[PDB]
Amino acid sequence: AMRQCAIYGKGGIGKSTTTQNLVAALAEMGKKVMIVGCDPKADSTRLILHSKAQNTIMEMAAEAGTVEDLELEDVLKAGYGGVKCVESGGPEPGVGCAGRGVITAINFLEEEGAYEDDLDFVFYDVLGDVVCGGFAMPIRENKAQEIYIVCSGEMMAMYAANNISKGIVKYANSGSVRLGGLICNSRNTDREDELIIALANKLGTQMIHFVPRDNVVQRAEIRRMTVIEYDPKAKQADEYRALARKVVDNKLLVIPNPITMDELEELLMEFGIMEVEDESIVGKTAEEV
Amino acid sequence: AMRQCAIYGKGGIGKSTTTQNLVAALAEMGKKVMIVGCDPKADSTRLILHSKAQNTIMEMAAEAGTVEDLELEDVLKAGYGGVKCVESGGPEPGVGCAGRGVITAINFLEEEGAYEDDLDFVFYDVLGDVVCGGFAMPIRENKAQEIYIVCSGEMMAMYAANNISKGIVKYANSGSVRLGGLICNSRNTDREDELIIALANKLGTQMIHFVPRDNVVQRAEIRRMTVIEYDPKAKQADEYRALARKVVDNKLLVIPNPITMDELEELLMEFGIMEVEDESIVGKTAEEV
Numbered sequence: 001a002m003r004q005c006a007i008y009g010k011g012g013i014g015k016s017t018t019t020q021n022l023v024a025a026l027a028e029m030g031k032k033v034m035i036v037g038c039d040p041k042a043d044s045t046r047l048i049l050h051s052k053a054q055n056t057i058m059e060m061a062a063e064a065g066t067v068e069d070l071e072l073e074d075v076l077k078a079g080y081g082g083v084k085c086v087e088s089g090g091p092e093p094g095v096g097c098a099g100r101g102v103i104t105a106i107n108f109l110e111e112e113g114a115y116e117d118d119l120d121f122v123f124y125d126v127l128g129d130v131v132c133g134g135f136a137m138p139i140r141e142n143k144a145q146e147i148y149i150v151c152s153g154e155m156m157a158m159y160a161a162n163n164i165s166k167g168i169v170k171y172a173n174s175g176s177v178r179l180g181g182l183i184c185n186s187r188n189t190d191r192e193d194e195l196i197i198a199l200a201n202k203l204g205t206q207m208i209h210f211v212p213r214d215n216v217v218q219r220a221e222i223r224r225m226t227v228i229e230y231d232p233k234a235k236q237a238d239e240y241r242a243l244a245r246k247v248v249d250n251k252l253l254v255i256p257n258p259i260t261m262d263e264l265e266e267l268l269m270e271f272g273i274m275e276v277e278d279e280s281i282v283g284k285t286a287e288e289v
Numbered sequence: 290a291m292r293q294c295a296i297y298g299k300g301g302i303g304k305s306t307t308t309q310n311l312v313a314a315l316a317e318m319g320k321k322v323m324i325v326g327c328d329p330k331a332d333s334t335r336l337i338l339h340s341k342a343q344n345t346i347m348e349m350a351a352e353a354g355t356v357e358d359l360e361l362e363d364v365l366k367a368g369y370g371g372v373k374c375v376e377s378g379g380p381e382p383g384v385g386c387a388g389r390g391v392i393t394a395i396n397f398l399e400e401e402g403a404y405e406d407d408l409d410f411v412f413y414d415v416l417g418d419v420v421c422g423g424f425a426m427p428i429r430e431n432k433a434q435e436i437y438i439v440c441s442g443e444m445m446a447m448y449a450a451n452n453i454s455k456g457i458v459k460y461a462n463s464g465s466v467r468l469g470g471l472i473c474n475s476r477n478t479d480r481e482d483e484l485i486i487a488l489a490n491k492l493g494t495q496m497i498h499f500v501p502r503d504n505v506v507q508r509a510e511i512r513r514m515t516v517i518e519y520d521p522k523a524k525q526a527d528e529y530r531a532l533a534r535k536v537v538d539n540k541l542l543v544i545p546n547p548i549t550m551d552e553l554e555e556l557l558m559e560f561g562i563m564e565v566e567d568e569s570i571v572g573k574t575a576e577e578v
């Protein structure tokens with residue numbers, strides 16, 4: 001019954017907008033969901049709770065002494081459609097390991113029985129520019145079985161998607177963490193949809209949805225909510241409902257086949273983002289060739 | 290003589306293009322320089338060496354058993370204008386700490402006498418989406434005295450700039466590492482130049498150059514070289530020469546003043562990137578407000 005999922009990806013590609021809107025769509029489907037924010041920007045639960053960045057486990061532990069002094073209901077707050085929201089937080093920019101807050105947050109929620117509520121889904125919203133501390137921990141330990149990567153038709157997004165796939169490959173013997181699919185969040189680049197379908201096919205997964213870039217997202221967010229609550233009858237609202245329907249129905253959970261930097265560049269070259277290169281003109285100035 | 294500098298920023302803002310073009314301009318004006326790539330994407334020296342991703346210390350020490358059997362000329366390669374290039378590399382994407390290569394690379398380079406050359410400058414090219422392990426090590430230990438943050442007029446770029454600034458503030462009593470300035474690498478957004486001037490003033494630093502988005506960069510990069518080498522007469526080349534003049538002559542090295550996330554959003558509202566929001570619309574639907 002209960003399925004633990006995780007939305008990984010590059011910084012600023014759209015995983016908090018996508019996770020909060022897909023989760024809000026699962027709420028109006030009758031599913032009880034929990035979002036666990038695993039990005040040091042603590043704004044992964046803003047739109048569900050109608051708030052400024054939610055108080056994190058890290059901040060509340062620091063005000064109370066330690067995590068031993070916290071109560072689950074002080075940390076886990078309910079919002080739109082009853083989805084329960086928590087934020088990990090993490091170390092200050094100078095110190096330690098930036099992903100440490102994710103390890104102490106999942107361990108607290110386990111000890112406090114947050115997963116033993118009547119949850120249909122858990123969605124971890126995790127930073128994916130670096131795949132290594134508590135950021136790699138939903139994969140390394142068997143916490144998030146279905147990984148969906150939000151990316152777009154640019155090098156860093158696709159590079160991040162490929163590296164997250166290599167982390168899934170590394171622990172594939174250790175548990176049941178598999179790649180569920182790729183979510184192309186549109187930047188309105190020309191053959192973008194086709195390029196993420198092609199990357200997906202190289203990795204052995206699918207592009208489970210192409211989310212359009214729509215301004216209703218901004219209009220919904222100054223009111224501090226998801227599009228699903230702001231304009232339930234917007235075009236974009238049905239785009240998130242459709243992503244929610246396909247994630248619920250999805251059974252393709254694979255061990256991905258990560259590609260090389262060459263095959264990644266060749267993907268962008270085939271789809272016209274990067275321009276074609278040849279070895280003859282390599283190292284030669286503008287006036288020579 | 291030798292000044293140690295580090296270029297930080299969010300993934301994909303253009304700190305490898307900016308650092309190689311800037312160093313190529315420095316070699317073109319007689320300065321002896323070394324680039325230490327401190328980003329797990331190992332392509333920070335591509336354009337100087339006319340190559341694919343340069344063999345990292347991490348790769349070479351892995352297929353050799355230890356870092357003891359590595360020779361300095363296998364690791365440090367000279368290219369355009371005599372600038373020496375070394376790549377740190379990084380662990381496999383689900384293991385260790387993504388910044389470990391930076392710690393073993395700099396300690397190898399110190400022991401092997403790479404800083405005892407008559408170098409005028411050293412540039413570290415560093416991943417700034419997380420400021421925490423080997424990534425934080427140029428600041429934590431007093432390695433790079435002058436930090437220049439490449440950023441743009443969108444939230445993640447400015448967020449990373451502020452967090453790197455907090456990193457510098459955390460180790461201010463420990464050494465001489467200060468923020469030298471901000472480098473706006475253009476996304477062709479309207480009042481972006483003014484926005485980063487105003488972020489910089491808030492931080493107590495300067496926008497030491499506005500780098501324009503120019504396609505001659507993509508034409509130079511398929512030839513696998515810098516604009517400084519490919520077309521020295523093009524407009525973008527005189528833009529990287531201007532930035533290099535201002536870095537050689539920069540004497541503003543400050544302990545920055547990090548702003549709050551509210552103040553960051555108010556900056557994006559004031560320059561028309563993010564839209565204006567009040568608390569009377571917060572929480573209400575499309576059909577109400």
Ligand SMILES: Nc1ncnc2c1ncn2[C@@H]1O[C@H](COP(=O)(O)OP(=O)(O)O)[C@@H](O)[C@H]1O
Binds near residue numbers: 015017
């Ligand atoms: N489909 C979309 N249409 C419009 N704006 C979007 C869309 N998806 C995301 N955004 C905007 O992109 C930026 C980053 O989204 P966010 O979800 O915060 O990214 P990330 O959590 O991965 O850091 C914000 O302006 C967000 O509102």
Ligand SMILES: Nc1ncnc2c1ncn2[C@@H]1O[C@H](COP(=O)(O)OP(=O)(O)O)[C@@H](O)[C@H]1O
Binds near residue numbers: 298307503
């Ligand atoms: N001034 C510029 N004009 C045009 N394209 C640029 C410019 N600076 C960087 N780029 C492009 O931006 C992308 C990222 O640059 P890069 O320096 O590799 O980023 P980062 O080192 O921060 O990961 C590539 O397409 C690069 O060629």
Ligand code: SF4
Binds near residue numbers: 097420
């Ligand atoms: S393990 Fe990752 S998040 Fe932690 S200190 Fe290292 S690079 Fe930073």
Ligand SMILES: [Mg+2]
Binds near residue numbers: 015
């Ligand atoms: Mg987010």
Ligand SMILES: [Mg+2]
Binds near residue numbers: 328330
């Ligand atoms: Mg780079």
